[PDB]
Amino acid sequence: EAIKWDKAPCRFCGTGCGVLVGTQQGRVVACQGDPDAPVNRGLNCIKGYFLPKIMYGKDRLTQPLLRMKNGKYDKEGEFTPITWDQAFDVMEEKFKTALKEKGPESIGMFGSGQWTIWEGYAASKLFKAGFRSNNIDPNARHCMASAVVGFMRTFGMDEPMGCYDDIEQADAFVLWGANMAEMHPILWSRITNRRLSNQNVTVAVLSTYQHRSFELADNGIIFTPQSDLVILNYIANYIIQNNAINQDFFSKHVNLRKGATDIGYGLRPTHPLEKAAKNPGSDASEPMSFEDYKAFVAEYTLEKTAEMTGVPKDQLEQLAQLYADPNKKVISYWTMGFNQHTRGVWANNLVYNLHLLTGKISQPGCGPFSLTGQPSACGTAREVGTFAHRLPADMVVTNEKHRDICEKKWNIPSGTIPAKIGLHAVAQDRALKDGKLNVYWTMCTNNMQAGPNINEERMPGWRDPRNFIIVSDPYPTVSALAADLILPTAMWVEKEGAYGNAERRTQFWRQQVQAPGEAKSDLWQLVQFSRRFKTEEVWPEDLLAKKPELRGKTLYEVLYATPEVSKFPVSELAEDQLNDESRELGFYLQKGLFEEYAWFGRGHGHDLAPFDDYHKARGLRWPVVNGKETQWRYSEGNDPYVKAGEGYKFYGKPDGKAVIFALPFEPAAEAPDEEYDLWLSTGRVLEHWHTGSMTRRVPELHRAFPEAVLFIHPLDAKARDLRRGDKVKVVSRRGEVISIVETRGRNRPPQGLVYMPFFDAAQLVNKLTLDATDPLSKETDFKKCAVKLEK
Numbered sequence: 001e002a003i004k005w006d007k008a009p010c011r012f013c014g015t016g017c018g019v020l021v022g023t024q025q026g027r028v029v030a031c032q033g034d035p036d037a038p039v040n041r042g043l044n045c046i047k048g049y050f051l052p053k054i055m056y057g058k059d060r061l062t063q064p065l066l067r068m069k070n071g072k073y074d075k076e077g078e079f080t081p082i083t084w085d086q087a088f089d090v091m092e093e094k095f096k097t098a099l100k101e102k103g104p105e106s107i108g109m110f111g112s113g114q115w116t117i118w119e120g121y122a123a124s125k126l127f128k129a130g131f132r133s134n135n136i137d138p139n140a141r142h143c144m145a146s147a148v149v150g151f152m153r154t155f156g157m158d159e160p161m162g163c164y165d166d167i168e169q170a171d172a173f174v175l176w177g178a179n180m181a182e183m184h185p186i187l188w189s190r191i192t193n194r195r196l197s198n199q200n201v202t203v204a205v206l207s208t209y210q211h212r213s214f215e216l217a218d219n220g221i222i223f224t225p226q227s228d229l230v231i232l233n234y235i236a237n238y239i240i241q242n243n244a245i246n247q248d249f250f251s252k253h254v255n256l257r258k259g260a261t262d263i264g265y266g267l268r269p270t271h272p273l274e275k276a277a278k279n280p281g282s283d284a285s286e287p288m289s290f291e292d293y294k295a296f297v298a299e300y301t302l303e304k305t306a307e308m309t310g311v312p313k314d315q316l317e318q319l320a321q322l323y324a325d326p327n328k329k330v331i332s333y334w335t336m337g338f339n340q341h342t343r344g345v346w347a348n349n350l351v352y353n354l355h356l357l358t359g360k361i362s363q364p365g366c367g368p369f370s371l372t373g374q375p376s377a378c379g380t381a382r383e384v385g386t387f388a389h390r391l392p393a394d395m396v397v398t399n400e401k402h403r404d405i406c407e408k409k410w411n412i413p414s415g416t417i418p419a420k421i422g423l424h425a426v427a428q429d430r431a432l433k434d435g436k437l438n439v440y441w442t443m444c445t446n447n448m449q450a451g452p453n454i455n456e457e458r459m460p461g462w463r464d465p466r467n468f469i470i471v472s473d474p475y476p477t478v479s480a481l482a483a484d485l486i487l488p489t490a491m492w493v494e495k496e497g498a499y500g501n502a503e504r505r506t507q508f509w510r511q512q513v514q515a516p517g518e519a520k521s522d523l524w525q526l527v528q529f530s531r532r533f534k535t536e537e538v539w540p541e542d543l544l545a546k547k548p549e550l551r552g553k554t555l556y557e558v559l560y561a562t563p564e565v566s567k568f569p570v571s572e573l574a575e576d577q578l579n580d581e582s583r584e585l586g587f588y589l590q591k592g593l594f595e596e597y598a599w600f601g602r603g604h605g606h607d608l609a610p611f612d613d614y615h616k617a618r619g620l621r622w623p624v625v626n627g628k629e630t631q632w633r634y635s636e637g638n639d640p641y642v643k644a645g646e647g648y649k650f651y652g653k654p655d656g657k658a659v660i661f662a663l664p665f666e667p668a669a670e671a672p673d674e675e676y677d678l679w680l681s682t683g684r685v686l687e688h689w690h691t692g693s694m695t696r697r698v699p700e701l702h703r704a705f706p707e708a709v710l711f712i713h714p715l716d717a718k719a720r721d722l723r724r725g726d727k728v729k730v731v732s733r734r735g736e737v738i739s740i741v742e743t744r745g746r747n748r749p750p751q752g753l754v755y756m757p758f759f760d761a762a763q764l765v766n767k768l769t770l771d772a773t774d775p776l777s778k779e780t781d782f783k784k785c786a787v788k789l790e791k
């Protein structure tokens with residue numbers, strides 16, 4: 001009857017604040033900053049604050065709903081309650097018919113950086129090892145794919161080599177389009193402490209519009225969309241021009257390559273920009289001489305930079321001067337500005353160069369730090385490998401040796417994991433539209449609302465009668481309402497969980513409460529489904545002839561209830577500890593999966609701690625080796641994978657050196673023209689998360705920001721007969737929405753640029769956006785398209 005408090009990471013942004021959750025009488029009634037979490041040390045943003053309301057939204061789903069018409073499934077039918085048994089019958093039949101008629105390629109899953117590590121792992125096994133389809137792709141394809149491809153190109157291993165502790169040791173902070181004041185508030189406040197308490201510290205904030213992070217900027221810069229590539233190249237030039245190359249670091253630790261150019265925009269091949277492409281979608285590169293490079297960036301003159309970006313010459317020099325100064329510990333930060341960008345991989349590589357020329361990396365207070373938006377985009381989506389090309393621990397389906405390790409460990413026949421790359425996020429949109437993808441299960445995502453260009457591909461595809469759409473969600477979203485089967489899902493602290501944040505910190509949480517009705521977690525869903533299939537129904541005969549001891553076995557027995565996954569008995573759980581899945585299946589399912597999964601990366605640079613260690617700690621940052629977590633990767637002393645006297649080893653590349661890539665500016669896919677005269681950028685707002693399905697179900701979050709507005713410059717409204725408060729129609733070549741004029745909000749765009757958040761389900765901004773992606777990462781450029789306003 002006293003409140004019970006236990007740790008969990010925050011359900012929201014990638015900062016990964018530690019939280020103490022208070023339960024009483026089967027409800028979460030209180031939630032506070034965990035004092036002893038090193039991330040936030042008790043601090044909290046308004047979203048973390050309202051965590052106890054997110055589960056008690058008004059219309060939680062409690063029951064599977066199928067579209068039905070006199071007693072049977074119908075695409076045009078009315079959502080009607082059916083049992084779990086019946087929901088799996090229909091799913092069983094749908095998957096089994098697709099496998100029969102077009103095979104594994106006609107079946108797909110759309111997963112999430114909001115999945116629990118084990119949910120991600122289970123899903124991958126189901127799809128890759130069970131059904132033999134790589135058509136599993138996440139959330140995170142809209143988000144971190146560009147930073148990930150960037151890491152792989154520059155370092156050969158994923159994820160940052162610094163940590164949040166760099167904040168209170170930095171001399172200078174450069175945010176490359178990150179609105180950290182709103183999207184990483186706990187980081188911001190820590191930066192704010194650093195800045196405000198120390199006069200020799202500088203803060204540069206570059207953005208496409210003025211926002212709340214400008215408040216703390218010594219060097220506040222507004223540039224033109226895409227022009228960051230110019231600035232990035234310019235600073236590199238400046239460093240050379242000013243003899244600021246750290247020679248010693250440069251000599252032992254860097255290679256130079258030139259990247260392939262004129263790569264298109266990851267649109268349908270029929271599209272003008274694809275036909276016009278020279279090297280469409282190529283990530284190819286060749287070794288490059290130093291003077292080749294020096295000539296390359298010499299094109300990027302202070303004068304040209306100023307023109308191409310609209311930013312004052314002296315401000316560009318103040319900025320490049322921070323990188324060049326040999327005594328300035330610098331942190332570089334970026335988020336979707338760099339990542340949701342048609343040359344975002346290039347962006348990523350381009351910013352690394354800056355750090356790599358100057359030797360500013362893998363040291364306390366000093367490093368390039370790719371921020372992550374989602375709570376477990378890193379720990380789940382990226383580390384487990386819930387992508388179409390992926391296997392655990394940075395491994396690729398494309399590599400026969402990688403396939404071998406996984407097939408051997410999982411104890412499935414040789415050759416069962418498929419070698420062909422599956423369909424990425426936007427490609428799944430395109431395949432659905434085409435009737436090529438006929439069975440499609442979405443989990444822990446709101447893609448009808450979050451994915452780009454709704455009208456053109458996704459809505460017609462989802463609604464196509466050749467297709468069967470399944471969504472698992474705690475709430476009836478835009479996505480759920482567009483589906484054919486809705487599966488009611490356990491959320492956050494209604495299950496045992498694990499999330500991995502932006503600084504490689506893995507954080508566990510015990511189950512504290514129980515889901516309403518018959519809501520089950522994604523882990524239950526996936527694992528109970530696996531029992532509906534026999535090996536002979538998913539694997540070809542001559543795969544079975546390699547291990548005939550698996551004939552007549554279900555994907556359940558084969559992927560989840562193996563002696564290995566089930567080593568761990570329920571007696572290991574505390575007597576009064578909730579764990580619906582494990583208590584049902586009679587073994588500690590989360591740990592067995594975790595311990596089989598951790599195996600891949602242990603001893604290969606990705607080391608996860610013993611399962612049970614995370615249940616004690618307020619998280620651990622990997623590699624965790626002999627009890628000891630890693631704060632800085634790739635530097636001697638800090639990382640146990642660097643030998644004595646090496647100084648720096650980037651052991652992700654065969655030869656241990658990081659790679660600088662010379663890459664040009666290329667223009668955004670769609671810029672303003674005569675008709676569509678304004679830039680449109682999109683993103684978030686402090687008080688809302690993503691599509692708002694959770695935060696809008698919080699009375700007071702809704703009351704702080706009830707509707708999406710359109711942030712517009714006074715004179716752009718003036719010139720259009722639009723006044724603050726006016727109803728306004730925003731129109732692109734792809735669709736339209738009706739919003740409200742805001743000339744005096746927190747975001748003040750320069751003239752010519754309009755900005756709009758996507759949380760509001762009545763104002764679907766992704767009816768406007770262009771599904772052009774970085775052709776290398778396949779990440780959609782949500783930040784940049786052309787638009788017009790009518791009254």
Ligand SMILES: Nc1nc2c(c(=O)[nH]1)N[C@H]1C(S)=C(S)[C@@H](COP(=O)(O)OP(=O)(O)OC[C@H]3O[C@@H](n4cnc5c(=O)[nH]c(N)nc54)[C@H](O)[C@@H]3O)O[C@H]1N2
Binds near residue numbers: 208224683
């Ligand atoms: N309150 C809140 N916080 C969140 C979330 C949320 O929903 N709500 N979601 C989380 C997730 S998953 C994500 S991915 C993040 C996103 O976090 P951010 O990327 O920080 O925020 P957004 O609102 O998505 O991005 C708008 C920013 O894009 C920049 N931008 C636009 N065009 C360009 C360009 O050409 N170049 C560059 N360099 N920058 C550009 C603008 O400067 C602006 O700063 O937020 C995370 N945290």
Ligand SMILES: Nc1nc2c(c(=O)[nH]1)N[C@H]1C(S)=C(S)[C@@H](COP(=O)(O)OP(=O)(O)OC[C@H]3O[C@@H](n4cnc5c(=O)[nH]c(N)nc54)[C@H](O)[C@@H]3O)O[C@H]1N2
Binds near residue numbers: 374684
């Ligand atoms: N225009 C535009 N579009 C964008 C972006 C942008 O800046 N501009 N940002 C992109 C980025 S960075 C991201 S990360 C994506 C995010 O896009 P999404 O991840 O699709 O959006 P969310 O609202 O996070 O979706 C999470 C869903 O899961 C439900 N849910 C909560 N807990 C659980 C659970 O345990 N299980 C299940 N099954 N469901 C659960 C919530 O109700 C919610 O419907 O959006 C991308 N789309």
Ligand code: SF4
Binds near residue numbers: 012
């Ligand atoms: S900063 Fe992020 S992790 Fe911390 S409380 Fe806010 S939303 Fe949650």
Ligand SMILES: [Mo+6]
Binds near residue numbers: 142144372373374
């Ligand atoms: Mo994101």
